[PDB]
Design a protein around this ligand. Structure first.
Ligand SMILES: Cc1cn([C@H]2C[C@H](OP(=O)(O)O)[C@@H](COP(=O)(O)O)O2)c(=O)[nH]c1=O
Ligand SMILES: [Ca+2]
Length: 129
């Protein structure tokens, strides 16, 4: 996989963010994770976590997997990195997202994220508390 540049337009929630990519505004949905909706428990905390990570970054990058790059709603599907740290993973490691939506051919970082989840769960963090 390859990292590509993007810039933040606006944080949205725990697992969606609006970025400018190749000069065009797009909503991205984070691969392989599910954060609670804002109205659900840990939703606000997930929103806040993602917002802080992307707003504080000097450099946002997008990394598409090998499969589908957009979902049926037109959202980009990618791993998102903030100053080199994967937001997807960081969410899972902090117990603010579950590994989820693992579809074959867009699952390159599945094992990485399952490992993060196992550690979050062992720590009894957030969703696992
Ligand atoms: C994360 C991801 C979501 N989706 C679609 C599946 C779900 O369809 P439904 O809307 O029919 O449930 C929805 C979940 O996104 P949200 O968790 O953002 O609601 O997005 C994909 O198609 N591919 C993906 O990789
Ligand atoms: Ca969600």
């Amino acid at each position: 996989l390859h990292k590509e540049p993007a810039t933040l337009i606006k944080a949205i929630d725990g697992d969606t963010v609006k970025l400018m990519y190749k000069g065009q505004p797009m909503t991205f949905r984070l691969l392989l994770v599910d954060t609670p909706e804002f109205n659900e428990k840990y939703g606000p905390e997930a929103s806040a976590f993602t917002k802080k990570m992307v707003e504080n970054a000097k450099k946002i990058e997008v990394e598409f997997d090998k499969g589908q790059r957009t979902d049926k709603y037109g959202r980009g599907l990618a791993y998102i990195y903030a100053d080199g740290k994967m937001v997807n993973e960081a969410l899972v490691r902090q117990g603010l997202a579950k590994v989820a939506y693992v579809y074959k051919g867009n699952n390159t970082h599945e094992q990485l994220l399952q490992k993060a989840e196992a550690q979050a769960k062992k720590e009894k963090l957030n969703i696992w508390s």
